[PDB]
């Protein structure tokens, strides 16, 4: 089997904001790591562009 | 006096389509004689707003199936030019079953389509014509082309087409055996190479069409007329039938009747006058009758209590449940399983769907599945009204309008014919138990 | 029911990329005119015509044949691959020099068309799938022709043959094995659309060149 001796391997915590976590790691006493939230970036969407007359997006099959 | 009540008597000094049955010659020389091609110069000369005003006052309705007005389709073209070339495409695919007018129409008086090509392109500002017709009908394309070249040498089509100044083409494009190419973005993708499978709308062919260019995409019938509405006047051709169902059609009489034939007979005559005065009437009498699908497999059919008072235009029929379609009548007598001809026409729709969209696909066959089994009497009652909440999660769910004609029958049939359901269910555990 | 062909193609000693295909200069000639017809920088468009070309000179499809389409037209072999398996014309496997093919749609059938098709096989003494031994004749069911009107119908190689019963269909197929053509059309003194007797409509002359013409023009 798969053995450990780490008490907080399983150890997850929610929090509403950075801040929050932050606090409470800092409260805490813990050293912390935050990274940025990544979102995706809006993206332009058509249809229509998939049938350009003159265009590259022009889809070989549909 | 105006607003007529008693349609359905015109005679030949009104009918479009003279030379219907080919007695006439199919050649130039035979559509000029006739009436053809005639003051095409001064027609194309008047513009594209005087052209556009004469569908639109004629009141034309789409003749392919669904009625759209067509003055204001054609004026979705009337825009300044972008810098792409505009189209015109003529829908020669004719798929539906019990349809039979556009072979016609092609076969014996191609003359009549191309001249309504040119006219159709001078007032939608297109730049060349192609008309797609079916793979199946190789000798109408040939005849088809044969027209469009005594038309070249003529001068009436090419460069400057007429002593006009305007520039257009005609290409015949022939499809592969395909019903769901009689679709219009389906067709526009057969065009360019692709399976044809119909695109999504957003965006209209006007906008998004073939190559990407503007296109519009015309019924044959539709297109034929045009030139003889512009001579005659959107007045004259608003002169028959009733309101918002102008003009004359075409109609296929066919199934259970003495004489099936084809014939062009005003828009609001009577099913029961078309069909005993033109077709014969039914084989062993009116009372014969069981049921009669009017538009093509793609309508509802309706019962004998309403084929014997309802008119044969758009809103009559739509009126009675079931929808005017192609006007291509179906005739079936007392005589016939009623359920095994659905059945046939539900195979028909498994085998000509696309597979793109996930209700048609799935849903299709699954009908076709489920009928198969009612033809025999295999299931139970309470799987009828299955059945009919199986067509509403397809119809109008799917891209394309093959769900729709799918789904149409099946509620026909059940709202009409249910109980010739229940006792074949009855009869079949009876003899199973 | 069910389909019957296969949408996979597996190599075999008579259908493999390596089988013999080319077009004939004058199909070549054509296939410059096909392709003139579309814009330019839209060649695909001519795959639809120049498959059918194709199978006009060889009789079927070779996936050799798509191979050679797909180069000749700069388009991936599997946009062709597409084309051909959508298109229920195009033969992927070789059929008969006769390629008859029965309506048994609805208004089609409603005439009886089952008396054509079992009339067809016992003179053939071949299914509804099959091709006869001596390679002549293939049968199959389809779909709606467009010739409702003309049911029990039947299209063989480009010709319409309607208005059957067992007995012209049976004489129609003499006649195609005893190298001869048979006319087509109506086999019931038809020759048209028309009404079987009477002729209800359409018998006065067609009136002259602007005998409608509104004023104005
Ligand atoms: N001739 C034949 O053999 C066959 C005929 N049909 C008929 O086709 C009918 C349904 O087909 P659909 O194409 O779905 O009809 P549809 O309801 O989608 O519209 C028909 C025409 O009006 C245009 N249109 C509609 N709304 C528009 C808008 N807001 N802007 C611009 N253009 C617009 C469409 O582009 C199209 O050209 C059926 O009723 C059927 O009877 C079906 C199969 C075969
Ligand atoms: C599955 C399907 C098949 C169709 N087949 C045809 C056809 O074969 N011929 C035709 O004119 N219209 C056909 N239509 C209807 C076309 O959309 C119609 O022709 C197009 O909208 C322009 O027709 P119109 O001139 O009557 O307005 C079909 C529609 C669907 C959904
Ligand atoms: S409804 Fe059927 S034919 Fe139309 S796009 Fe969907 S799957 Fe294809
Ligand atoms: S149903 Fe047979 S040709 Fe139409």
Not at chain 2, 6 to 34: C, M, P, V
Not at chain 2, 291 to 298: N, T, W
Not at chain 3, 1 to 17: I, Q, S, W
Not at chain 3, 162 to 167: F, H, Y
Request: charged share 25%; glycine share 10%; aromatic share 8%.
């Amino acid at each position: 089997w798969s053995s450990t001796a780490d008490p907080l391997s399983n150890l997850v915590l929610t929090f509403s904001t950075k801040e929050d976590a932050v606090a409470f790691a800092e409260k805490n006493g813990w050293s912390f790591d935050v990274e940025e939230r990544k979102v995706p970036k809006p993206k332009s969407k058509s249809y229509g562009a998939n049938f350009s007359w003159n265009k590259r997006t022009r889809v070989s099959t549909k | 006096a105006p607003k007529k009540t008693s349609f359905g008597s015109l005679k030949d000094e009104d009918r479009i389509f003279t030379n219907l049955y080919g007695r006439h010659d199919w050649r130039l020389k035979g559509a000029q004689s006739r009436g053809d091609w005639y003051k095409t110069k001064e027609i194309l000369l008047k513009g594209p707003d005087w052209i556009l005003g004469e569908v639109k006052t004629s009141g034309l309705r789409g003749r392919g199936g669904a009625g759209f007005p067509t003055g204001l389709k054609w004026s979705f073209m009337n825009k300044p030019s972008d810098g792409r070339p505009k189209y015109l495409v003529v829908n020669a695919d004719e798929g539906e079953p019990g349809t039979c007018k556009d072979r016609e129409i092609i076969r014996h008086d191609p003359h009549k389509l191309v001249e309504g090509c040119l006219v159709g392109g001078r007032a939608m500002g297109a730049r060349a014509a192609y008309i797609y017709i079916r793979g199946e009908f190789y000798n109408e394309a040939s005849n088809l082309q044969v027209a469009i070249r005594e038309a070249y040498e003529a001068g009436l089509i090419g460069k400057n087409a007429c002593g006009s100044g305007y520039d257009f083409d005609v290409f015949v494009v022939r499809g592969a055996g395909a019903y769901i190419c009689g679709e219009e973005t389906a067709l526009i993708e057969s065009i360019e190479g692709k399976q044809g499978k119909p695109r999504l709308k957003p965006p209209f062919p006007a906008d998004v069409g073939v190559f990407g260019c503007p296109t519009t995409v015309a019924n044959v019938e539709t297109v034929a007329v045009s030139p003889t509405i512009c001579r005659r006047g959107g007045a004259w051709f608003a002169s028959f039938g009733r309101e918002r169902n102008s003009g004359t059609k075409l109609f296929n009489i066919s199934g259970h009747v003495n004489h099936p034939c084809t014939v062009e007979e005003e828009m609001s005559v009577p099913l029961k006058e078309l069909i005993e005065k033109h077709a014969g009437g039914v084989i062993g009498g009116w009372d014969n009758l069981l049921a009669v699908i009017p538009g093509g497999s793609s309508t509802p059919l309706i019962p004998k209590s309403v084929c014997e008072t309802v008119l044969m235009d758009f809103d009559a029929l739509v009126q009675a449940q079931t929808g005017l379609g192609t006007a291509a009548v179906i005739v079936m007598d007392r005589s016939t399983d009623i359920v095994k001809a659905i059945a046939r026409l539900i195979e028909f729709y498994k085998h000509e769907s696309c597979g793109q969209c996930t209700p048609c696909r799935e849903g299709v066959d699954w009908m076709n599945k489920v009928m198969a089994r009612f033809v025999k009497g295999d299931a139970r009652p309470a799987e009828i009204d299955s059945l009919w909440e199986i067509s509403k999660q397809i119809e109008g769910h799917t891209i394309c309008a093959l769900g729709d004609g799918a789904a149409w029958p099946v509620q026909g049939l059940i709202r009409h014919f249910r109980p010739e359901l229940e006792e074949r269910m009855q009869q079949f555990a009876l003899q199973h138990q | 029911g069910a389909g019957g062909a296969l949408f996979v193609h597996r190599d075999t000693p008579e259908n493999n990329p390596d089988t013999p295909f080319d077009f004939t200069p004058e199909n070549y000639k054509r296939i410059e005119a096909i392709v003139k017809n579309y814009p330019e920088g839209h060649k695909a468009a001519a795959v639809l015509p120049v498959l059918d070309l194709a199978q006009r000179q060889n009789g079927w499809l070779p996936i050799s044949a798509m191979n050679k389409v797909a180069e000749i037209l700069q388009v991936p072999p599997m946009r062709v691959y597409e084309v051909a398996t959508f298109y229920t014309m195009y033969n992927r496997k070789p059929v008969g020099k006769y390629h008859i093919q029965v309506c048994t749609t609805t208004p089609c059938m409603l005439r009886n068309s089952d008396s054509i098709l079992e009339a067809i096989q016992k003179k053939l003494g071949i299914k509804v799938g099959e091709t006869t031994p001596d390679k002549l004749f293939t049968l199959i069911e389809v779909e709606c022709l467009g010739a409702c009107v003309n049911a029990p119908m039947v299209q063989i190689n480009d010709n319409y043959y309607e208005d059957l019963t067992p007995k012209d269909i049976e004489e129609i197929i003499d006649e195609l094995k005893a190298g001869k053509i048979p006319k087509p059309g109506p086999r019931s003194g038809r020759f048209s659309c028309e009404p079987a007797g009477g002729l209800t409509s359409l018998t006065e002359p067609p009136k002259g060149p602007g005998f409608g013409v509104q004023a104005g023009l």
